[PDB]
Amino acid sequence: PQITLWQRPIVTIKIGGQLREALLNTGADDTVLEDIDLPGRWKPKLIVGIGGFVKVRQYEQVPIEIAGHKVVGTVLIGPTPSNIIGRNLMTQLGATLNF
Ligand SMILES: [Cl-]
Numbered sequence: 001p002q003i004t005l006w007q008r009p010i011v012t013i014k015i016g017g018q019l020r021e022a023l024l025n026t027g028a029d030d031t032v033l034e035d036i037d038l039p040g041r042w043k044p045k046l047i048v049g050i051g052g053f054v055k056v057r058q059y060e061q062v063p064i065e066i067a068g069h070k071v072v073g074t075v076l077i078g079p080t081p082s083n084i085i086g087r088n089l090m091t092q093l094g095a096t097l098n099f
C-alpha cells in the first residue's frame with residue numbers, strides 16, 4: 001500500500017491466528033510486540049525501557065503478515081508501550097519512504 005502520515009501509521013498484523021495492530025516506525029531498528037505468544041525457543045535481549053532496560057524474548061524466522069503482506073523475520077516479544085514494526089521487517093517488505 002501507500003500510507004500517508006497525517007495520522008500514526010498503524011496497520012493490521014497477523015502472526016498465526018493472532019490478529020493485532022502495530023505502528024510502522026522508521027525510527028525503530030527492531031520489531032517489538034506485547035500481545036502475542038509464540039512457541040519454542042527464544043533468546044533473551046535487552047531493550048531500553050523506563051527503568052533502564054527491559055528484558056524481551058527474541059524469536060527468529062517468524063512468519064508475519066503486515067497490512068496483508070507476508071514476510072519472515074525477527075520479532076521481539078515483551079513489554080512495550082505500543083506494538084512497533086521496525087526497520088528489520090520493513091526491509092523484508094521492501095518498504096521505502098517516498099517524497
Ligand atoms: Cl493519529
Ligand SMILES: [Cl-]
Binds near residue numbers: 010011
Ligand atoms: Cl492494514
Ligand SMILES: [Cl-]
Binds near residue numbers: 015017
Ligand atoms: Cl498462532
Ligand SMILES: [Cl-]
Binds near residue numbers: 072073074088089
Ligand atoms: Cl529480521
